[PDB]
mmCIF file of C-alpha atoms in Angstrom:
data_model
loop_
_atom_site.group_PDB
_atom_site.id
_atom_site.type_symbol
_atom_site.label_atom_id
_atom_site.label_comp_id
_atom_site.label_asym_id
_atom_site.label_seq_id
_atom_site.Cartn_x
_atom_site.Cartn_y
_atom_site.Cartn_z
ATOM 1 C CA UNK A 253 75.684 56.952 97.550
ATOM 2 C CA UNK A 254 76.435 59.048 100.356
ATOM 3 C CA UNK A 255 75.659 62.841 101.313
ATOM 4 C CA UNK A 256 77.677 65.436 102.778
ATOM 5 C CA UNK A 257 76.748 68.994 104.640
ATOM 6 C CA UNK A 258 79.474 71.147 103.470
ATOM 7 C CA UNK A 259 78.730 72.174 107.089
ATOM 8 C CA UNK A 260 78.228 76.178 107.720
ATOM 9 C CA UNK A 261 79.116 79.321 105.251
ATOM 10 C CA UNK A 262 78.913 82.146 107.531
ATOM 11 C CA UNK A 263 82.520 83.670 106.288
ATOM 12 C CA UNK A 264 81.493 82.635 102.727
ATOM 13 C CA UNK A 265 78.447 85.108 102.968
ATOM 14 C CA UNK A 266 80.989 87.488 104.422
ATOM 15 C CA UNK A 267 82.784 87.224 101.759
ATOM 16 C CA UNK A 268 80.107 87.537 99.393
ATOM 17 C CA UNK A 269 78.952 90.832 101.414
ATOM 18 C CA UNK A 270 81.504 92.880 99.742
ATOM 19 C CA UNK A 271 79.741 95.701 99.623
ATOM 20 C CA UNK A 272 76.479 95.593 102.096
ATOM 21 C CA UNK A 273 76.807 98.520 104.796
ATOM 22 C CA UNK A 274 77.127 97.248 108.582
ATOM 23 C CA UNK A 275 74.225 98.596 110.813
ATOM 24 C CA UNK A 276 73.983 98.227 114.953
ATOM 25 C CA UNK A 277 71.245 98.113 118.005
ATOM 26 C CA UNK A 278 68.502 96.813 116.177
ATOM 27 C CA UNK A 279 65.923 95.867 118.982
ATOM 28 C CA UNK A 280 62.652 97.032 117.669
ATOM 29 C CA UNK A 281 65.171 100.091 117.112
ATOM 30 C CA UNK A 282 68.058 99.295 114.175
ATOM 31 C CA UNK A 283 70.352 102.113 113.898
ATOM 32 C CA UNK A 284 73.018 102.520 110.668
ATOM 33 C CA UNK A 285 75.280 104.556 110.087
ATOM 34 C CA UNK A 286 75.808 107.276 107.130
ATOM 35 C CA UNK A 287 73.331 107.864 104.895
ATOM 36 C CA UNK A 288 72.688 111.757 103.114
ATOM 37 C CA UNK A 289 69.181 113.430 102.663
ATOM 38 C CA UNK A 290 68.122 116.697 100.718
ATOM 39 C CA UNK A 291 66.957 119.717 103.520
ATOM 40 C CA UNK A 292 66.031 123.123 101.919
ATOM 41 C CA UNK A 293 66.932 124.955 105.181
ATOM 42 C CA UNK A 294 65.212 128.214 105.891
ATOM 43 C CA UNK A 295 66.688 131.588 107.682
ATOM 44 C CA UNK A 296 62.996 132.228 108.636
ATOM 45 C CA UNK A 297 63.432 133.577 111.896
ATOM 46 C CA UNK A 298 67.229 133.764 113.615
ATOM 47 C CA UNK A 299 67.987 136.700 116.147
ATOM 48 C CA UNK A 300 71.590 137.283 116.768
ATOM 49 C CA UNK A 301 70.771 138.076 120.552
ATOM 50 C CA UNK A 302 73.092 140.791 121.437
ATOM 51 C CA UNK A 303 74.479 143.015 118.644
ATOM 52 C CA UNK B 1 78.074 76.200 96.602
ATOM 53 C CA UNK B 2 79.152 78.454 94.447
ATOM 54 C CA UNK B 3 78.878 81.551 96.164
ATOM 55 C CA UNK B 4 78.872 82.901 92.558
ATOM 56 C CA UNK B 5 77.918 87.034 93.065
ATOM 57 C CA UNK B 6 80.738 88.940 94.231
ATOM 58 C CA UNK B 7 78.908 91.894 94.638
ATOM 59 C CA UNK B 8 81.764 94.467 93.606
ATOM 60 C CA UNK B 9 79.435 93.804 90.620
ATOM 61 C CA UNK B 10 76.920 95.739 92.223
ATOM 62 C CA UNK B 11 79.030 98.291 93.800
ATOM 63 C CA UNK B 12 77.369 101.409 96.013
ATOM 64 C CA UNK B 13 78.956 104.513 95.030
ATOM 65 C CA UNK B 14 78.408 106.024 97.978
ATOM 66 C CA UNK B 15 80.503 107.929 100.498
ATOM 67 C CA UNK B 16 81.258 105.676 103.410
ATOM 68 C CA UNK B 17 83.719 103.305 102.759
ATOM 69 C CA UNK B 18 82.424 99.897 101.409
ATOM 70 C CA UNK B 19 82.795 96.414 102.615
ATOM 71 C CA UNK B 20 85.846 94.977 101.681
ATOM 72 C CA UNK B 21 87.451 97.660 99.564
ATOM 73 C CA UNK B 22 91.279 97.632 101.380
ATOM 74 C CA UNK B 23 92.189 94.264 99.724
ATOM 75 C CA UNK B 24 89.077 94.382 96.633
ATOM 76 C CA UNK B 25 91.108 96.600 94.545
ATOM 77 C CA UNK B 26 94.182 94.434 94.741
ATOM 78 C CA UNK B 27 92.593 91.237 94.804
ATOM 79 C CA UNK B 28 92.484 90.508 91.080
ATOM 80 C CA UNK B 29 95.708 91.706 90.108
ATOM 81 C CA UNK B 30 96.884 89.800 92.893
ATOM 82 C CA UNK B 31 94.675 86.536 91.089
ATOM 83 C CA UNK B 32 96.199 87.026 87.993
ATOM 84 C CA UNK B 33 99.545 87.245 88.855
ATOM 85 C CA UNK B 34 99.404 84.518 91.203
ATOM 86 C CA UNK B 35 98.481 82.948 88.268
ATOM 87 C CA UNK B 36 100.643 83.211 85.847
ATOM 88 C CA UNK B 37 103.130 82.621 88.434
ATOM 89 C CA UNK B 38 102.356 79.607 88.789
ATOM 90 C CA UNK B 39 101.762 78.573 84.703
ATOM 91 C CA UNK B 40 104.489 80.606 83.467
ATOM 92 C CA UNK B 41 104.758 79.175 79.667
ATOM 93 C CA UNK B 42 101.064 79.898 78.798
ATOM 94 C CA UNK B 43 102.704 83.499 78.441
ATOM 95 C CA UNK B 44 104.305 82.649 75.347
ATOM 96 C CA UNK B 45 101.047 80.220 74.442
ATOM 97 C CA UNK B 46 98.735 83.468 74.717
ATOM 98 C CA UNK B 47 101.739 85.256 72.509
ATOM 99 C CA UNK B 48 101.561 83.037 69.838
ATOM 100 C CA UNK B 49 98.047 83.068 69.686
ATOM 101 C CA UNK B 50 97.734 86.728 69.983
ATOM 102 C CA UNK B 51 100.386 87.326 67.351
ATOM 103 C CA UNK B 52 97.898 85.122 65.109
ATOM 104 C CA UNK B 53 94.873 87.542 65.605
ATOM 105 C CA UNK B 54 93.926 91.220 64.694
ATOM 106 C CA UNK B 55 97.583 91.495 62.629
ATOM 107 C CA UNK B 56 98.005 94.838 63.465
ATOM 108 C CA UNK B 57 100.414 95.786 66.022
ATOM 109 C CA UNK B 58 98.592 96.932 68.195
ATOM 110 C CA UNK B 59 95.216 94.639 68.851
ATOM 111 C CA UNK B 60 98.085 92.202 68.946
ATOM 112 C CA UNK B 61 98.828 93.210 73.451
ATOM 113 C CA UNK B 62 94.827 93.322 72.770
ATOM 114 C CA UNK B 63 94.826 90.000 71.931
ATOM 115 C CA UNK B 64 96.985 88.953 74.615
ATOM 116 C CA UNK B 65 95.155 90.974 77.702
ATOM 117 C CA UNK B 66 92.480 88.557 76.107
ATOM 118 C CA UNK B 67 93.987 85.325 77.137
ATOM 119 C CA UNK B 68 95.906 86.342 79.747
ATOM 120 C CA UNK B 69 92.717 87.245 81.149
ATOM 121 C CA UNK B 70 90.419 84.686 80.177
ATOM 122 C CA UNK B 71 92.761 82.109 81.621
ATOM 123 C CA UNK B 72 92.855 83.056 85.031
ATOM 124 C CA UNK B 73 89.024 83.340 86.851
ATOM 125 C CA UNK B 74 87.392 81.550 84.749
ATOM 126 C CA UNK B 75 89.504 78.629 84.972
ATOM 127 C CA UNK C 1 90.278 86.592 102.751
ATOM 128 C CA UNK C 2 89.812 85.945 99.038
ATOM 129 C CA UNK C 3 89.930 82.290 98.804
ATOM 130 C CA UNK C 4 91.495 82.459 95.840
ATOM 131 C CA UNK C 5 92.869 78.909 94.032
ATOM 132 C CA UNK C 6 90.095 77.564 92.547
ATOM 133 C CA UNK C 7 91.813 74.317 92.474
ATOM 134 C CA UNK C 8 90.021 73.631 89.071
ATOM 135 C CA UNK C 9 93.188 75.428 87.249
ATOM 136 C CA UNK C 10 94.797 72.880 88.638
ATOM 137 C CA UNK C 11 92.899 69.750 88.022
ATOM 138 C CA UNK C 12 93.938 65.847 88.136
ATOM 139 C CA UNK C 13 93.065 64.416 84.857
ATOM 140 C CA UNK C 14 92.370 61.072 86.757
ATOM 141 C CA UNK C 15 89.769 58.627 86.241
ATOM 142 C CA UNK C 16 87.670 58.528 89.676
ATOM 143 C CA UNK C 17 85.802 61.469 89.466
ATOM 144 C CA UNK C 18 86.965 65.026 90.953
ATOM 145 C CA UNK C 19 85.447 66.724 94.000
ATOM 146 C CA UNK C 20 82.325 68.953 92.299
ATOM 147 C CA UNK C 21 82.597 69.087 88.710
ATOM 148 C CA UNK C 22 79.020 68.123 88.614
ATOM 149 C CA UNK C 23 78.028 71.910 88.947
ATOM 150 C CA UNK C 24 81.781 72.872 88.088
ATOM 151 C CA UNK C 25 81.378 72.403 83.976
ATOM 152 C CA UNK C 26 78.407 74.442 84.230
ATOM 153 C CA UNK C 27 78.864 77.184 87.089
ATOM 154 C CA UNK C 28 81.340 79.837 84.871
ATOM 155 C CA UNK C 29 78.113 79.204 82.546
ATOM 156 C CA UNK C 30 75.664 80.374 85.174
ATOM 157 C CA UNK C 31 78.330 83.092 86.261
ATOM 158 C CA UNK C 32 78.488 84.974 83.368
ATOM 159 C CA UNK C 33 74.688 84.942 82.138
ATOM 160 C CA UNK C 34 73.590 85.999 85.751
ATOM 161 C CA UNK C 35 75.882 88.697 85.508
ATOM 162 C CA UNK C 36 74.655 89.868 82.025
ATOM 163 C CA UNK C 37 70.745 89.365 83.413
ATOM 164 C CA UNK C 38 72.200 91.258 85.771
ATOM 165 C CA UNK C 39 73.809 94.056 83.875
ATOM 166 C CA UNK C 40 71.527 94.231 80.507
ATOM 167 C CA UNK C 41 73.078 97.297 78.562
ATOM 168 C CA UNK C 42 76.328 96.366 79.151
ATOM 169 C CA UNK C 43 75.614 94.303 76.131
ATOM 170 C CA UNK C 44 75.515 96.868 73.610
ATOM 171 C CA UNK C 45 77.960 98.306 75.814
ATOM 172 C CA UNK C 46 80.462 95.431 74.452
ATOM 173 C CA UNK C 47 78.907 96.032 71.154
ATOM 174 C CA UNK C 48 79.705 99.698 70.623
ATOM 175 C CA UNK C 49 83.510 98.417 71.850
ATOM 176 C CA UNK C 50 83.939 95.679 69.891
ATOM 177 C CA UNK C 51 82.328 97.033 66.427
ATOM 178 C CA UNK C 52 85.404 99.542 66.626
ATOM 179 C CA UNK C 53 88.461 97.389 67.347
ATOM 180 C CA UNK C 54 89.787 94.463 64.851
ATOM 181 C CA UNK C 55 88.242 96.066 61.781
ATOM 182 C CA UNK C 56 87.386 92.489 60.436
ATOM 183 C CA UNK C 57 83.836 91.474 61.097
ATOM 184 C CA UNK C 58 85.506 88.618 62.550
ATOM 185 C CA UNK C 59 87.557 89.582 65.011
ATOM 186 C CA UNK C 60 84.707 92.027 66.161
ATOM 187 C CA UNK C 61 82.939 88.627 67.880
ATOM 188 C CA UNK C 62 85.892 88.415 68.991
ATOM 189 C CA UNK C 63 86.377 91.435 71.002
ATOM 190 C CA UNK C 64 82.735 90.784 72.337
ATOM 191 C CA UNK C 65 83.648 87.521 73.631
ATOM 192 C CA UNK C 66 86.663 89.204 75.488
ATOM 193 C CA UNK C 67 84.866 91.980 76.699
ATOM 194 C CA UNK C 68 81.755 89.858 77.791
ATOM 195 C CA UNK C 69 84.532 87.541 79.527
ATOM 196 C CA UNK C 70 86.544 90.170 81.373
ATOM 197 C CA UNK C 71 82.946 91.568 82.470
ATOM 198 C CA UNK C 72 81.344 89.011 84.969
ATOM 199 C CA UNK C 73 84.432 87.441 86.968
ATOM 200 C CA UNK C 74 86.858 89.996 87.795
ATOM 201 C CA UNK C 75 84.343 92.876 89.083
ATOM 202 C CA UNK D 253 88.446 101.925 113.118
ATOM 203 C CA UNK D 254 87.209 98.397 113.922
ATOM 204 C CA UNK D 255 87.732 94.814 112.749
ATOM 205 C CA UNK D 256 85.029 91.952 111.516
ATOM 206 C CA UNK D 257 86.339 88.211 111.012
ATOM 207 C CA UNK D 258 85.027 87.080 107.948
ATOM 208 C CA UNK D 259 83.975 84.029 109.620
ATOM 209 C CA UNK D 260 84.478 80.504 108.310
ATOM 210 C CA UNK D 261 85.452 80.103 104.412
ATOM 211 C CA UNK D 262 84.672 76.567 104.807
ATOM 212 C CA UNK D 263 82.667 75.914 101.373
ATOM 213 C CA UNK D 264 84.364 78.683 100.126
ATOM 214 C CA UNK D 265 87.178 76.074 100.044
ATOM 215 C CA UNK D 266 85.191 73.925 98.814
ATOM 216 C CA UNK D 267 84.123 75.858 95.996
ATOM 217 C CA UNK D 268 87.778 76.946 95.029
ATOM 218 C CA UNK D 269 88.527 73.050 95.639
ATOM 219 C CA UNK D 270 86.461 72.445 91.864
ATOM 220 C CA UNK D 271 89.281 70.589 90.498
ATOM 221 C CA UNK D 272 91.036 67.806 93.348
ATOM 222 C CA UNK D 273 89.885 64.468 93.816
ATOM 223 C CA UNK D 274 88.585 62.937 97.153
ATOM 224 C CA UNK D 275 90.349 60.397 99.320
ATOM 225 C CA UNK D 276 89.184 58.219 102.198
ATOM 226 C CA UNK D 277 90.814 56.338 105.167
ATOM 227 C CA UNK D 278 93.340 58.098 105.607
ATOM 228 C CA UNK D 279 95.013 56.700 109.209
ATOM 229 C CA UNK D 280 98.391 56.690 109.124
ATOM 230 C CA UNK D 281 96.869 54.944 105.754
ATOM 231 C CA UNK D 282 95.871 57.217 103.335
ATOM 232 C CA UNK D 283 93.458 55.772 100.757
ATOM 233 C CA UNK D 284 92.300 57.263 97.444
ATOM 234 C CA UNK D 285 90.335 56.587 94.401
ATOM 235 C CA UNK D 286 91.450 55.895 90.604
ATOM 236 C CA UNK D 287 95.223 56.366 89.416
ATOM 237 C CA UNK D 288 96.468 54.615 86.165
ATOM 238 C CA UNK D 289 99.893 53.309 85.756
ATOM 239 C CA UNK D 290 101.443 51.078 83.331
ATOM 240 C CA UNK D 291 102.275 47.440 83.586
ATOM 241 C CA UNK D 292 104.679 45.382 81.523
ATOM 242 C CA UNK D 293 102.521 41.252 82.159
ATOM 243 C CA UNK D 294 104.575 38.597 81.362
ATOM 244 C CA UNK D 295 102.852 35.282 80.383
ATOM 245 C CA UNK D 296 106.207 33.742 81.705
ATOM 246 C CA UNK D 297 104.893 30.586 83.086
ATOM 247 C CA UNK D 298 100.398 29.832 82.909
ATOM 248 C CA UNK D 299 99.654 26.691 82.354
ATOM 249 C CA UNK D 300 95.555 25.857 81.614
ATOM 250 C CA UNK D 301 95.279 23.079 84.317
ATOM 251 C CA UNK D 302 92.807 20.566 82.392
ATOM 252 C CA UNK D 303 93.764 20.174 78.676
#
């Protein structure tokens, strides 16, 4: 009996990432890209300067 | 290695575009009908087996999505 | 780049034994109960679909084997 | 728009490959485990050499 590696499946987890969302600079500081929110906005205080 | 989850399965509905989408929702048909392309007579296998279950008419093309799509992933 | 061929649908029934069967005859096993640990309701999802086609009591298993078998491998 | 690589399938390969049979030394001399075949033996001419 031998033994074999099957050596490295880097595009076979990119295959299997079929639906994870790609994300960039990372540092201490990882940034993605869309994601929504709720935000109950408020008209508080707006002046129209110069009616 | 298996890489057994393709995680369509676990799909994000979710605005952005997803992973791999382009060629996803083509990739199956695409399995299947390379397929049967290449085992042509188990069409008329799956149609006699078919026309042996449901006798109806009608779960009859049930019968046969059935094997005609057992036969190709899991294989 | 679906790899697709699993070469398995194309096996040599030869005596020296094949390239991985040893988790082959038991990884569309694994596939499809992950996927239902995975995706629980889904049972009685098949249920509700298969107790209304065939109209036999046993063809209904039937259609729960085929819709429990399209479920896991082509999502 | 962009493009990613999907890496190495490797083992994905390997995984789709759940059906072929291995072969060795291959050379210009390709070697490879069992194949049957049939064989017509002829006891034409055995004598026991000691009777």
């Amino acid at each position: 009996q031998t033994v074999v590696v099957l050596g490295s499946q880097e595009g076979a987890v990119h295959t299997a990432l079929a639906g994870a969302l790609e994300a960039e600079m990372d540092g201490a500081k990882g940034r993605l890209s869309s994601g929504h929110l709720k935000c109950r906005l408020k008209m508080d205080k707006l002046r129209l300067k110069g009616v | 290695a298996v890489t057994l989850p393709s995680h369509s399965t676990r799909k994000l509905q979710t605005r952005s575009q997803t992973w791999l989408e382009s060629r996803e929702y083509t990739k199956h048909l695409i399995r299947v009908e390379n397929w049967i392309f290449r085992n042509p007579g188990f069409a008329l296998a799956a149609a006699a087996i078919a026309w042996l279950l449901g006798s109806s008419t009608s779960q009859k093309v049930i019968y046969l999505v059935m094997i005609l799509l057992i036969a190709p992933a899991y294989s």
